[PDB]
Symmetry: C3
Subunit: 206 residues, 3 copies
């Protein structure tokens, strides 16, 4: 790991959760994010073209922190490493995935939602996690309770984070950044509203 997990969190207060259904949208969406001050991109493995979109983004804009999300299996993890991803994010964790991230060249950010899941990740050497789905898995009260026992663990809450609540999450001492789709809404991507997306990103990156 040359890129440290903490670098995936320090890049932006908000990590955009990107769903790319059409490959032609990948590059103009990325340029819109860059113009809006966002230099970390999580390309989720949720569509057939996602791997090709990740490859296209890394080939075109290699000096951005472009990684993959929804990495569920070791096989997907090796696929995104091979595609050039700078990091891998998962909505949860498995033992196999945690093992795979130990010997990897790029950081894995596993997802957890209970103290035992956190402790399993900690035992494997991980101390940067996604908290997912944050709003449905206990929200701010959960993160405060965890902070009292694991003050040094750092989280990126994702899932139900939006304009109205994201500052409340960011203010927590164990929250390094948040993630969500509200700055890259699917409707604006589908309809090529790139300048709008820049404006939504500017509202959170300034």
């Amino acid at each position: 790991w040359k890129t440290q997990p903490g670098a995936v969190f320090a890049a932006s207060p908000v990590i955009p959760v990107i769903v790319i259904k059409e490959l032609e949208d990948a590059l103009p969406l990325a340029e819109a994010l860059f113009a809006g001050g966002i230099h970390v991109l999580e390309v989720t493995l949720r569509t057939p073209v996602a791997i090709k979109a990740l490859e296209l983004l890394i080939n075109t804009f290699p000096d951005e922190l472009i990684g993959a999300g929804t990495v569920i299996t070791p096989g997907q993890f090796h696929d995104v490493v091979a595609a050039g991803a700078r990091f891998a994010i998962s909505p949860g964790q498995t033992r196999e995935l945690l093992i795979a991230g130990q010997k990897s060249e790029i950081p894995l950010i596993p997802g957890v939602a209970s103290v035992s899941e956190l402790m399993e990740g900690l035992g494997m050497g991980y101390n940067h996690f996604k908290f997912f789905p944050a709003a449905a898995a206990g929200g701010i009260p959960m993160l405060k309770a965890i902070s009292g026992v694991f003050p040094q663990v750092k989280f990126c809450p994702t899932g139900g984070i939006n304009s109205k609540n994201y500052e409340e999450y960011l203010c927590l001492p164990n929250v390094a950044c948040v993630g969500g789709s509200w700055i890259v809404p699917e409707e604006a991507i589908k309809n090529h509203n790139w300048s709008l997306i820049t404006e939504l990103c500017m509202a959170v990156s300034s």
Copy 2:
């Protein structure tokens, strides 16, 4: 993995509501079953929550061999082997362990394990499971939890159980990743104790039609 003759999706497709059956008195098994059948419910989950449960399971399977009768509250591999040997057509669990998931993939009979977090779901997927009980649904994040999961695992199918009732079950059934729900409200212990088989049939008919 998951090449069972009886597929979990077929179990889920048989009824919008799987009744969570608690049988305390063996004499109640047949009339309770008749009330369910009459109310259009032909998938029965006999829970392993009472001393007579295994006997009631065996009695129901032997008496009604053409019905889709299985077991619930299957916690251990030993209990799973017990309900297989009793003739259960499926096993449902409120959660999962590696050993339980291993037992289900070694069996002719499908296992429907329980999950409540994304990591638990991911361990289940790693063992070839993609049909799960979500338990206890209402206390483990409810509809917002299921909606969040659907955006990330759109193919995974759930049977939410735990706090599902007449007033909210349709809200759960409308979700794209919910194939059916489970609950005791259509087989309530008060009606079973009173031998109120007409009421049970009426409750079942309301959800099956």
Copy 3:
């Protein structure tokens, strides 16, 4: 196990979750707890002096049920056992910690927050658990739903339990006791407010019925 997990839960309706910053406060705090009827002490591994306080309390009061909390790792479990702890409590569980507790004469109370976590503990011989953080992880509805499927499993809910809600938790058939800092607030410890701590403990001791 020299002490049974159920004995840890049966000692008091409320286990005091102790954060001790100054070693000289350990003996006077114990006196305030004893005077309020409470003889189970959970010294949390959250301060530099916690291990030394644990050892001091056990050596001073060997006949009291003095144990450790916030035991995260097998290494910490071995440290508190060597320190003389009568029990160890964890906010969660891992396979490694469950294995370590199997090999000890000192009871381990793992923390769980889902049925699958409970089942992993059950499979390794555990049926007394902390439910943490109780108020944020599903609360009373979660415990009630679990009680129907695991009537043999006993819980100590901790995290967000206070004087306003603890009796509601205690009424549940699968809740043997609760844990909380509200009967041992850090401000009262720092200020040597033993009369307040004793008053708070006396209130929860009159709720002990077995």
